[PDB]
Amino acid sequence: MRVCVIGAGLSGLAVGHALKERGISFVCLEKAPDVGGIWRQPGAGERGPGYRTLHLNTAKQLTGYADFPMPDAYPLYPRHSQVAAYLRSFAEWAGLLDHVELRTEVVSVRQDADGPWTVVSRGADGAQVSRRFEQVVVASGHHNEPALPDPLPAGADSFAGTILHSLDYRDGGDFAGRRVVVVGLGASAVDIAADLSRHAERTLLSVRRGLHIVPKQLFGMSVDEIAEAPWWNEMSFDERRRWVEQALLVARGRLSDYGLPEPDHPVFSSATTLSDEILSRIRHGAVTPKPAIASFDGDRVVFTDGTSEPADAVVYCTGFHMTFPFLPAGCPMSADGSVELYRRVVPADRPGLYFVGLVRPVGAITRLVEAQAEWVARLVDGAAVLPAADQMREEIGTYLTGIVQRYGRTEGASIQVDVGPYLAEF
Amino acid sequence: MRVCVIGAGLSGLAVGHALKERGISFVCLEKAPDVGGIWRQPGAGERGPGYRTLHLNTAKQLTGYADFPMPDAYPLYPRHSQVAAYLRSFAEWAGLLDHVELRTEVVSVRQDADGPWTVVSRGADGAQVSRRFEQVVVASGHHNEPALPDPLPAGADSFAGTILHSLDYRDGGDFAGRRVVVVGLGASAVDIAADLSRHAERTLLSVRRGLHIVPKQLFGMSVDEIAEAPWWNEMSFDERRRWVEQALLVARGRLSDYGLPEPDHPVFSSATTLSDEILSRIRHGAVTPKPAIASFDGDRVVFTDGTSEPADAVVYCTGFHMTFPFLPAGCPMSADGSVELYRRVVPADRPGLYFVGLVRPVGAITRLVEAQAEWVARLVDGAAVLPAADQMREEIGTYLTGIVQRYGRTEGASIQVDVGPYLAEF
Numbered sequence A, B: 001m002r003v004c005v006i007g008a009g010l011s012g013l014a015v016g017h018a019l020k021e022r023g024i025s026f027v028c029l030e031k032a033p034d035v036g037g038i039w040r041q042p043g044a045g046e047r048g049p050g051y052r053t054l055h056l057n058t059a060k061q062l063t064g065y066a067d068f069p070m071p072d073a074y075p076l077y078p079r080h081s082q083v084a085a086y087l088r089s090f091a092e093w094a095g096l097l098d099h100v101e102l103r104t105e106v107v108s109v110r111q112d113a114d115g116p117w118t119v120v121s122r123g124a125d126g127a128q129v130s131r132r133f134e135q136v137v138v139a140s141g142h143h144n145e146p147a148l149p150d151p152l153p154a155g156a157d158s159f160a161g162t163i164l165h166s167l168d169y170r171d172g173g174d175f176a177g178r179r180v181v182v183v184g185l186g187a188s189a190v191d192i193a194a195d196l197s198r199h200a201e202r203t204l205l206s207v208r209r210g211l212h213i214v215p216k217q218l219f220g221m222s223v224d225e226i227a228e229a230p231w232w233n234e235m236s237f238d239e240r241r242r243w244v245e246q247a248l249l250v251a252r253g254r255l256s257d258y259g260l261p262e263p264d265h266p267v268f269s270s271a272t273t274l275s276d277e278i279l280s281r282i283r284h285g286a287v288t289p290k291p292a293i294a295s296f297d298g299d300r301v302v303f304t305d306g307t308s309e310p311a312d313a314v315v316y317c318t319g320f321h322m323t324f325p326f327l328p329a330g331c332p333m334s335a336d337g338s339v340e341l342y343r344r345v346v347p348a349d350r351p352g353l354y355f356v357g358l359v360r361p362v363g364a365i366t367r368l369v370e371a372q373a374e375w376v377a378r379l380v381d382g383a384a385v386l387p388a389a390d391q392m393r394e395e396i397g398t399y400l401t402g403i404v405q406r407y408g409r410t411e412g413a414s415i416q417v418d419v420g421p422y423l424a425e426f
């Protein structure tokens, strides 16, 4: 009754836990057949952002819930199946499942004039139910819609093979003996190339804009464990950048030596890509770096340097769009596409609505959603209060100006936070 | 007529090339159906030291013959199939195949009282032929016989699964869905574990004595490219050790943090194991480090720490014995098992017999066998000469004392040379 939680992935489970601890009644609605969010999809063969070789790139003890450690037998970087199993175990332990409605997709969420929210949901039959709830917490993730390149290169319509997005990608043994191009250089791109590199006959890695590729580990420590270290926090933002630049050079040399393009920005400016594999796969000839794709010639892909390769498939690892189809007016934004949420959570003008998990930090999101969940629970039952709308808008404007100043315009920049100072105010 | 070369792998092809350039007639006898030595066996499904995932761990431009570069499209670390194809291409280019007798196994080599050598060979039929040759060059490799642990752990005879050597290992998809233990920490052990780590359900890495595990690359340079660098040769043996120890720490931390045993010797003392993969496979939980195997309990392996695991297979990656079954008195040795060859090539008491490739340097053997081949060719047609037997024995005693002093006793220590000073005298 009191709260409808949309989604039972890592974020929504944290919200359900925080609400349950305060005696706040709630129901959690999940589209999938089980809890876990993206982490259970591979393994269920379901189409989603993950893939069968996906592991954490964050340390296990900083990715698990703080009051619910993962099994001691788990490694530092558990597999997706281990994470999914861990998340379902939490739900069981926390007593959340009697509040979870599976195979229930939220279709529409509207604010009623007297305050509560009307939520329409569709069950497994396809039936539709209309319920009213006092408040709504959105935990539906932001890796929802595939983002393919604005213009697909010329000739894509007359391509003898299959063009797909990483969402459609699952294993790679599905490309055994084939020839495949991977487009991009994010986390998905390097992992998928690496996987393809052991199944396909030829794996090409088409890159246009360079990113800094970083090993998962320096000095034996994970990069996220490094940021928590006190000596690292004692260093100045340039002593850090300096420290990393030197460590990278020693650990792997220069990016250009791998046939990759050098980024136009320093290591911490922009997104780093973590991989223990991709540079080595290039040295062994199992992945061939290329520049952008210029066109499609039947069974062949032509690149902007005049070279061409036969290709049975192209896998676009170009990311996801943040979308909220059940919100008619969408997530609050500032036209520029900049998200407008107070402390990254609260809409300034929609009382009783909250967004949890819509933050992109360095490292695991778990401590962030835990603090958001706890704060939202106290907002729900009146133990915490909000500023007036103007003052909330003041914090939003200040946060955005600091973002433009830092990452200027790009995409998704307006949910970026640094885990340290953000957690500090909770 | 003049020279019989035993073996048409990398070493024997180099010998044939050096002899052909001097007009020295020769025939090269090879057991296998083609040239290439170990490098063609995977790919032909043949049992041998290699495996289907085996790549060079040496740089391509320092592993190829100096007058015959590998294709420019080859990567830094070519696959075994690329190396095998490259070696056959050399043989064709160098005009060696009309001198090569394939599917011909040498059965016996005996010195006749008047000087020449009687060689008995067996062809494809199984027929035996006896031929006399003026001189014999042995290029039969030293990775011939499997070396399994002196005592297999108790209970091996009542083991529900299969115990095999790395010689018998080929791919790993042959262990799909299974549970496997790998014994050892050499090059074969880490590569095979890494491969198993993507096929098997569980891969355990049983290690007793610790070795230093080193990435194939530091500062973007291969470790063998580093040793040739002039700044590295300008450094003192401790400035080097010091330099590496620090670089390792930055590149991967400490071995003990991976659940591996720390070696009892500094990095350059003993054999280093090169791998870009094994430490990361451990962090992802895809390889589980263990100590020695204490026993076999049906379908389970018990380790010296009291733990146990179900296991369908155990792959012993414990190396190879150096053997010469066609030499009745064997390779000349000093009883201690120490090889007794002048400049690592020449027996002191057997005129007209030579051993090429029986050296273990840091990095690729190719420049060494090239210099040995050229020198042997000049020995064969009288353009170079040898010391008296006592003086040759003097060089052998000096070399051995320096070996014991350096690597003390161990196994195979008596063919170890440092590529730099060894090439320097040719």
Ligand SMILES: Cc1cc2nc3c(=O)[nH]c(=O)nc-3n(C[C@H](O)[C@H](O)[C@H](O)COP(=O)(O)OP(=O)(O)OC[C@H]3O[C@@H](n4cnc5c(N)ncnc54)[C@H](O)[C@@H]3O)c2cc1C
Pocket (backbone or CB within 6 Å): A006, A007, A008, A009, A010, A011, A012, A029, A030, A031, A032, A036, A037, A038, A039, A049, A050, A055, A056, A057, A058, A063, A104, A105, A106, A107, A139, A140, A141, A142, A143, A187, A188, A326, A356, A357, A363, A364, A365, A366
């Ligand atoms: C490829 C990839 C790799 C990542 N790797 C790491 C990593 O190594 N370490 C790390 O710390 N973080 C990682 N992350 C980020 C983070 O762990 C995930 O984004 C995390 O799963 C976020 O959880 P969530 O609950 O916010 O979102 P999700 O996992 O997306 O869960 C959202 C849930 O909402 C449900 N839902 C959506 N719409 C509806 C609807 N209309 N009705 C009902 N239910 C709905 C979905 O079915 C889903 O179950 C990764 C993210 C991606 C995409």
Ligand SMILES: Cc1cc2nc3c(=O)[nH]c(=O)nc-3n(C[C@H](O)[C@H](O)[C@H](O)COP(=O)(O)OP(=O)(O)OC[C@H]3O[C@@H](n4cnc5c(N)ncnc54)[C@H](O)[C@@H]3O)c2cc1C
Pocket (backbone or CB within 6 Å): B006, B007, B008, B009, B010, B011, B012, B029, B030, B031, B032, B036, B037, B038, B039, B049, B050, B055, B056, B057, B058, B063, B104, B105, B106, B107, B139, B140, B141, B142, B143, B187, B188, B326, B356, B357, B363, B364, B365, B366
């Ligand atoms: C697993 C492994 C990995 C290696 N990786 C590298 C690497 O990455 N880089 C590098 O530089 N070096 C590497 N080496 C070392 C080196 O490249 C090989 O040892 C090299 O193949 C040596 O060539 P060879 O001709 O001396 O020996 P082999 O390759 O063993 O060739 C010997 C030949 O003699 C033949 N022969 C033997 N007995 C007879 C007989 N009675 N009659 C007829 N023919 C006979 C055999 O059939 C074989 O073809 C590796 C070695 C091993 C075992």
